[PDB]
Amino acid sequence: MRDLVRSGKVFLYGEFIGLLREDHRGFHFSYNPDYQGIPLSLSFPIEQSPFHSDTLFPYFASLVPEGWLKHKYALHQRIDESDMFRFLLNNGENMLGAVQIQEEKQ
C-alpha cells in the first residue's frame, strides 16, 4: 500500500469482519463483502455497509475505556477524535471484546 491515512482490520469474536479507516474527510467503517454474520452493533446493519462520518462513529468512540479518557485531565489534553482512533489502533488486540489490528505495512 501507499498512504495516507489510517486503516484498521476489524475482528469480532475471532473473525475478520471489515475495515475502519480515517482520512481528511473522516471515518469509514465497512463490512467485508462475504460477511454475513452477527452485526457489530445495531448502528451497523450489514445491508447498509459502508458507513461514513465526519466524526468517529459513536459505537467505536464508545470502546475507548473511561480510564483513558479520565487520564486527560491531567490536564487538560487534546481528545481530538484522531486521538481516539489512534488509541483504537494502538490497543487494539486486547482492550475492547472486539479487536483491531492496524493494517500495516502502511
Q: Which is nearer to Cl ion, 59 or 68 (CB)?
A: 59
Q: Which is nearer to Cl ion, 17 or 106 (CB)?
A: 17
DSSP the chain: ---SSEEEEEEETTEEEEEEEE-SS-EEEEE-TT--S--S-TT--GGG--EEESS--HHHHHTS-HHHHHTS-SS----TTHHHHHHHHHSBSSSSSEEEEE----
Determine, following the binding rule CB under 5 A, whether residue 98 of this chain makes contact with Cl ion: no
Q: Which is nearer to Cl ion, 52 or 72 (CB)?
A: 52
Q: How far is the CB of 56 from Cl ion (least distance, A)?
A: 9
Rounded distance between C-alpha atoms, residue 17 and residue 75, angstroms: 37
- Residues 23-82 touching Cl ion, rule: CB under 5 A, are 38, 43, 52, 54, 57-59
Q: How far is the CB of 71 from Cl ion (least distance, A)?
A: 24
Q: Which is nearer to Cl ion, 34 or 74 (CB)?
A: 34
Footprint of Cl ion (CB under 5 A): 38, 43, 52, 54, 57-59
